[PDB]
Amino acid sequence: LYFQSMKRIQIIDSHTGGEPTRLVVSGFPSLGSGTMAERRDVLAREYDRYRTACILEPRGSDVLVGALLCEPVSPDAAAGVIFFNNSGYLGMCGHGTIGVVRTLHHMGRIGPGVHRIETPVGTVEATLHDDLSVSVRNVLAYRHAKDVALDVPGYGPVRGDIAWGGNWFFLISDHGQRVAGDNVAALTAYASAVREGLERAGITGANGGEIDHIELFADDPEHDSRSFVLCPGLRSPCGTGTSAKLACLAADGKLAPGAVWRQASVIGSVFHASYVQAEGGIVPTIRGSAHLSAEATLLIEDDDPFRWGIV
Amino acid sequence: LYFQSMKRIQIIDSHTGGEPTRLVVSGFPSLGSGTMAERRDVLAREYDRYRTACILEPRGSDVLVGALLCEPVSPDAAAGVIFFNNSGYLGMCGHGTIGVVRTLHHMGRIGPGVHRIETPVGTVEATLHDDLSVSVRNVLAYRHAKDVALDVPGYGPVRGDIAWGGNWFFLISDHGQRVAGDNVAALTAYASAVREGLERAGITGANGGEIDHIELFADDPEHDSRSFVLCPGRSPCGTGTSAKLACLAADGKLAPGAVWRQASVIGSVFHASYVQAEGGIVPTIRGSAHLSAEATLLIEDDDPFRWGIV
Numbered sequence: 312l313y314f315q316s317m318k319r320i321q322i323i324d325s326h327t328g329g330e331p332t333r334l335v336v337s338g339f340p341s342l343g344s345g346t347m348a349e350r351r352d353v354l355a356r357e358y359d360r361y362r363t364a365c366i367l368e369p370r371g372s373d374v375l376v377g378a379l380l381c382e383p384v385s386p387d388a389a390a391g392v393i394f395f396n397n398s399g400y401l402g403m404c405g406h407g408t409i410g411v412v413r414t415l416h417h418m419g420r421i422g423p424g425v426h427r428i429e430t431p432v433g434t435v436e437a438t439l440h441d442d443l444s445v446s447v448r449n450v451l452a453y454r455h456a457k458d459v460a461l462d463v464p465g466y467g468p469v470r471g472d473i474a475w476g477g478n479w480f481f482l483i484s485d486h487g488q489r490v491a492g493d494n495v496a497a498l499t500a501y502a503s504a505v506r507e508g509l510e511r512a513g514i515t516g517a518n519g520g521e522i523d524h525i526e527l528f529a530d531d532p533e534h535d536s537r538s539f540v541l542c543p544g545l546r547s548p549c550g551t552g553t554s555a556k557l558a559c560l561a562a563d564g565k566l567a568p569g570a571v572w573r574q575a576s577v578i579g580s581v582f583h584a585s586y587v588q589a590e591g592g593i594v595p596t597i598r599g600s601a602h603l604s605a606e607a608t609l610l611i612e613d614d615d616p617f618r619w620g621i622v
Numbered sequence: 623l624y625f626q627s628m629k630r631i632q633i634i635d636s637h638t639g640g641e642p643t644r645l646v647v648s649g650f651p652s653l654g655s656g657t658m659a660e661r662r663d664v665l666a667r668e669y670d671r672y673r674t675a676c677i678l679e680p681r682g683s684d685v686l687v688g689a690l691l692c693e694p695v696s697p698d699a700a701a702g703v704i705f706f707n708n709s710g711y712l713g714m715c716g717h718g719t720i721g722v723v724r725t726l727h728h729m730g731r732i733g734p735g736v737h738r739i740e741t742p743v744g745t746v747e748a749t750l751h752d753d754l755s756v757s758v759r760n761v762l763a764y765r766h767a768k769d770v771a772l773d774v775p776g777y778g779p780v781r782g783d784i785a786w787g788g789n790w791f792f793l794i795s796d797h798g799q800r801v802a803g804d805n806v807a808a809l810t811a812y813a814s815a816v817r818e819g820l821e822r823a824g825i826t827g828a829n830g831g832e833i834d835h836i837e838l839f840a841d842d843p844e845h846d847s848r849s850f851v852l853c854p855g856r857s858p859c860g861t862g863t864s865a866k867l868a869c870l871a872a873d874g875k876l877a878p879g880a881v882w883r884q885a886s887v888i889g890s891v892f893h894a895s896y897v898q899a900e901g902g903i904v905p906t907i908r909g910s911a912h913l914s915a916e917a918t919l920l921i922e923d924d925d926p927f928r929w930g931i932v
């Protein structure tokens with residue numbers, strides 16, 4: 312009676328280098344048995360309130376990426392997923408997939424090895440390593456423009472690359488900033504000023520793509536690079552910028568196909584990557600670690616005005 | 623072996639008018655059997671990492687208030703609670719107590735009625751109503767200053783009251799804004815400019831207290847008032863009912879025991895009364911908390927942010 316006064320959605324939360332992913336294990340309505348793309352179309356049209364319940368406050372946050380677990384079409388896939396966020400439905404998500412694969416191991420569904428995950432944009436290949444880190448083959452990445460110059464209000468001129476790695480990035484090495492975990496405020500201020508400069512100048516990705524991620528790179532004594540990424544807003548989910556960086560290295564002849572590249576973030580998260588050439592860019596494979604944060608049942612009470620999230 | 627590679631903390635999340643509260647049911651270390659204040663001291667000194675695990679990202683957020691459930695000292699109390707947030711440990715929390723009491727009902731520990739909750743700053747009285755809303759007796763509230771004149775940058779002059787209701791509020795009726803749910807951007811910009819003007823002018827609460835909550839009021843066809851509160855930042859906020867009551871009382875606009883009804887721009891409704899006390903009023907505020915989640919927080923030995931991202 313009271314029990315029946317609220318819906319239940321079972322979830323498992325993880326984070327990959329501090330970016331959160333929420334895997335919905337059960338509690339969404341049936342979306343039929345077509346491809347992930349077709350199931351996503353049903354979810355988006357018939358049951359979008361379930362996305363908002365899971366992602367929006369008070370149950371989630373604007374930086375949260377969600378993934379709905381689905382039984383895949385092919386029996387040789389470990390799972391099917393549909394990714395979503397506070398704005399809508401996504402295609403592929405790199406750091407999210409690391410979370411998903413780690414979570415599937417936590418649930419006891421898979422052991423170390425190669426696994427295929429169905430998505431609305433195609434089947435993703437991933438390797439679960441013995442240490443439970445995951446190598447994920449991401450979408451096609453490429454550099455749109457090299458050494459694009461602008462004046463950063465309050466700081467001065469800089470050049471950077473415009474690159475696509477599932478998100479539009481402006482990538483800068485010669486920024487004069489100290490890239491370290493104890494300097495995030497100064498870095499954030501710099502990168503925000505950069506994004507504003509791009510706006511003012513009307514600098515975009517291909518087809519007017521909004522460059523909403525800024526990445527600052529620096530030498531590092533232990534890795535090939537130390538980076539800081541500024542995420543959309545001051546809000547939407549954040550990439551780590553590894554794929555975009557690889558596309559620039561590849562285009563400049565600094566890194567061959569197959570060569571291993573190692574990047575660390577200012578908060579200490581480490582990523583190892585390689586790429587293979589493809590038509591119109593590179594296909595990068597990125598290894599990273601996700602950690603578990605919670606198992607939960609979200610509760611959606613009939614009389615809660617924000618039961619489907621606060622909009 | 624795998625199971626033992628991580629700590630588990632059982633929590634229940636609720637929200638009262640969109641403001642979230644996290645009740646920690648189990649998984650913190652023992653804090654002894656002293657008073658709530660003595661247990662708080664042990665927690666703050668020995669086990670503060672447990673607070674950060676719960677409140678900080680990735681498991682929590684800056685606006686989250688936490689509450690650790692403890693076995694009370696008095697057998698006349700339903701529970702004991704230690705409130706905390708991202709910056710540290712709190713005393714009493716009105717909207718948080720609404721969540722706690724609703725949550726105790728969800729756990730099957732209490733039925734509708736009057737209950738006492740021990741806190742580090744004293745025993746709070748609350749009524750759980752049949753509809754599962756809760757009336758909480760809050761801390762002493764009072765008005766510090768009446769009709770303070772202020773130049774709002776980019777807007778022009780206003781009068782406001784400075785009042786304490788668990789927090790320092792600047793309360794304004796003559797703001798010239800439309801106080802409605804679909805107009806939060808403009809309301810936010812205006813309230814921000816107000817707070818900035820308070821800073822510039824050196825206007826504070828008693829003992830130089832920082833005025834970090836701005837509340838804009840307006841007439842409402844269904845209620846005594848419609849309000850918009852600008853919260854600090856980011857960190858949690860109250861909804862300014864107690865502070866408003868204190869000004870109403872001081873102006874002879876609302877008698878002790880008379881019922882006042884206030885709606886927020888997002889639609890949350892609070893009913894309230896007060897009784898006179900030494901140095902101000904003791905308000906009792908009724909509101910509704912809804913359940914958000916039941917969860918087991920997981921703290922892996924190898925996760926670098928296992929105790930929160932600091």
Ligand SMILES: O=C([O-])c1ccc[nH]1
Nearest residue numbers: 405406552553554597
């Ligand atoms: O930086 C990236 O593109 C990435 C892929 C998976 C995790 N990060």
Ligand SMILES: O=C([O-])c1ccc[nH]1
Nearest residue numbers: 716717861862863864
């Ligand atoms: O002062 C308030 O807004 C309040 C709400 C719930 C308890 N106190």
